[PDB]
Design a protein around this ligand. Structure first.
Ligand SMILES: CN1C(=O)[C@@H](NC(=O)c2cc(Cc3ccccc3)on2)COc2ccccc21
Length: 259
């Protein structure tokens, strides 16, 4: 979990807040983001190392790995694995259109990764294209760049279009697995529409049954996927499926008609 800046042979800052792509001696490339600068705390310094070892042990191919933490002379930084193509929305807004087979695979990988997290008792709450990272081979990893699951590191220093209606104007309602199912539905829309969807007048529209316009999807999208996004953004959370439920229907569909 613990790391030093001496371990990094070279680095390079980039802004996608701001991060450093550092080459580690033996492990290779890693992304680095300094959370806060100033004095070294005492009340919460011990917990920040425990919270990192809790996220470090979330080990799945479709989930971003926290590689370590760097604490040195009043600075606090998190170190994750490098994903070469950035985020899903960066990939979707490129010159060339991503094939339907690759989009179908991204969808299945987000399902695999979200079923993993739910099975480990972790609710995402902040699932959006910006938290779906892409490597140079078009395989994805679900991240937590907004620190929604890092409650300690969040205290050391967002998008409403993917947020389920039950959480719009009811911030005390505890987020559930069905909260993420709603967000995934809006991510499905964004994958085939190739853009971000859609304040008080909007939000109140979403609570009454308003959703992103499916007719805005110009490029080809399968009817079973359209049917899946409609079911996942159902206003009632109990009417939505679980990610293992989505997986048992989506995987046979991907393998027969898209792979
Ligand atoms: C350097 N850096 C990071 O290390 C980031 N780590 C994660 O997002 C992360 C998520 C998980 C596992 C995990 C995934 C999904 C839900 C819950 C849990 O493990 N690590 C955090 O802060 C950054 C912010 C911006 C840019 C870069 C970073």
């Amino acid at each position: 979990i613990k790391m030093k800046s001496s371990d990094f042979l070279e680095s390079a800052e980039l802004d996608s807040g701001k991060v450093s792509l550092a080459f580690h001696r033996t492990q290779g490339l890693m992304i680095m983001k300094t959370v806060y600068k100033g004095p070294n705390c005492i009340e919460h310094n011990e917990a920040l190392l425990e919270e990192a070892k809790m996220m470090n042990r979330l080990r799945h191919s479709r989930v971003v790995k926290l590689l370590g933490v760097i604490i040195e002379e009043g600075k606090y930084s998190l170190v994750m694995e490098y994903m070469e193509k950035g985020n899903l929305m960066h990939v979707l807004k490129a010159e060339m259109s991503t094939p339907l087979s690759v989009k179908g695979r991204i969808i299945l990988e987000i399902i695999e990764g979200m079923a993993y997290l739910h099975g480990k008792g972790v609710i995402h709450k902040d699932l959006k294209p910006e938290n779906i990272l892409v490597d140079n081979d078009f395989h994805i990893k679900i991240a937590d760049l907004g620190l929604a699951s890092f409650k300690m590191w969040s205290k050391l220093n967002g998008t409403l279009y993917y947020m389920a209606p039950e959480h719009l104007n009811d911030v005390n309602a505890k987020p559930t697995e069905k909260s993420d199912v709603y967000s995934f539905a809006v991510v499905l829309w964004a994958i085939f529409a190739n853009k971000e969807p859609y304040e008080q007048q909007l939000i109140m529209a979403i609570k009454s049954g308003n959703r992103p316009d499916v007719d805005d999807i110009t490029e080809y999208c399968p009817r079973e996927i359209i049917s899946l996004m409609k079911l996942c953004w159902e206003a009632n959370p109990e009417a939505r499926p679980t990610f293992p439920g989505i997986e048992e229907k989506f995987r046979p569909f991907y393998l027969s008609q898209l792979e």
